[PDB]
Design a protein around this ligand. Structure first.
Ligand SMILES: CCC(CC)C(=O)N[C@H]1/C(=N/OC(=O)Nc2ccccc2)O[C@H](CO)[C@@H](O)[C@@H]1O
Length: 331
């Protein structure tokens, strides 16, 4: 009853017999939700409940960053702003920006927790260099601003008992994309938020980027980035999730199973295989690596903390209503 290294997804709004088989697999350790898994809050809450009934130790995550990346947007879910908005608020009022960032984090996490979800793959720590796929998903250009805005956000997530996951290490702001900058330049700017956050950073997603001047391998498959730099230089002790291995160029010509074993060997504690459960099931049965005691420890600390308010109580909570007003007033 310990988490496995694979995070996959399920078939739809309710669990099928095939989902139950996959969830019960020892190498399964997480479920990532998408828009297709949300009809309404009642259905979503029932799904997460049924997932934990099959596998009590499972980690349930979702991409809730705000702006362009928010899977659940209806039936009462607060539409959250793009993180770039907070960087814009910082430039006009630093202290207010931190205050709002916390309110955004609390709403974000409180609403997910009311529906039985453990965590969100947020914040994005990539610097806003001016990448269309990142775009307004980044907080700011200045790594010191990204750090303190992200720190304030993760604080709000923590108020609801929710962890966090910075991405995409060591920096996606600047076949698989390449980055021909030197280690020093990458460290001095893009990595700085990861280092400065300290214990405020609970997990990392490495980017599917070749940092040519640093290592032949992508960050997610790089022992240099993950072991030497992230765990070694930065002393990071949190969980490392691979970025979606379903990307064509991520496999580098190999199978999903080989890419999964490579990421886990490089330093990943858990691999993501999204939008193809049958392919993820092949990985479950073909994976050579098994969850270690130290990886299990890190995965377990990503679970949500404490009791969550049900939706009917949350929307009338003073703190919740205070966050809403602050968000409405500042943006
Ligand atoms: C720097 C942007 C980067 C871009 C990589 C990105 O946005 N990465 C996201 C991602 N993207 O996953 C695919 O792009 N998969 C795909 C896309 C097209 C076809 C098949 C699979 O994965 C995980 C799991 O959701 C997210 O938390 C990541 O933030």
């Amino acid at each position: 009853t310990t988490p496995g290294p694979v995070m996959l997804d399920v078939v739809g709004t309710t669990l099928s017999r095939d989902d139950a088989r996959r969830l019960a697999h020892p190498n399964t350790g997480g479920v990532i939700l998408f828009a297709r898994h949300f009809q309404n809050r009642a259905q979503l809450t029932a799904l997460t409940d049924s997932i934990r009934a099959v596998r009590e130790d499972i980690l349930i995550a979702v991409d809730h960053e705000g702006g362009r990346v928010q899977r659940f947007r209806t039936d009462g879910f607060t539409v959250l702003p793009a993180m770039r908005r907070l960087g814009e608020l910082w430039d006009r009022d630093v202290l207010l920006a931190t205050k709002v960032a916390t309110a955004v984090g609390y709403i974000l996490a409180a609403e997910l927790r009311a529906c039985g979800i453990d965590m969100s793959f947020t914040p994005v720590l990539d610097l806003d260099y001016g990448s269309k796929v990142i775009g307004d998903r980044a907080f700011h250009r200045d790594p010191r601003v990204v750090t303190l805005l992200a720190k304030s956000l993760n604080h709000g997530l923590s108020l609801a008992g929710m962890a966090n996951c910075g991405k995409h290490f060591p920096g996606h702001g600047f076949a698989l994309p390449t980055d021909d900058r030197t280690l020093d330049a990458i460290l001095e700017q893009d990595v700085a938020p990861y280092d400065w956050l300290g214990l405020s950073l609970a997990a990392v997603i490495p980017a599917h980027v070749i940092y040519t001047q640093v290592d032949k391998r992508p960050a997610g498959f790089s022992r240099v980035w993950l072991q030497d730099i992230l765990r070694g230089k930065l002393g990071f002790t949190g969980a490392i999730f691979s970025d979606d291995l379903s990307m064509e160029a991520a496999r580098e010509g190999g199978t999903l199973t080989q890419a999964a074993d490579a990421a886990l060997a490089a330093g990943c504690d858990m691999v993501l295989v999204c939008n193809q459960p049958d392919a993820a099931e092949v990985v479950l049965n073909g994976l050579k690596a098994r969850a270690s005691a130290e990886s299990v420890r890190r995965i377990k600390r990503m679970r949500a903390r404490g009791k969550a308010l049900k939706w009917d109580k949350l929307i009338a909570q003073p703190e919740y209503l205070q966050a809403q007003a602050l968000l409405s007033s500042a943006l």
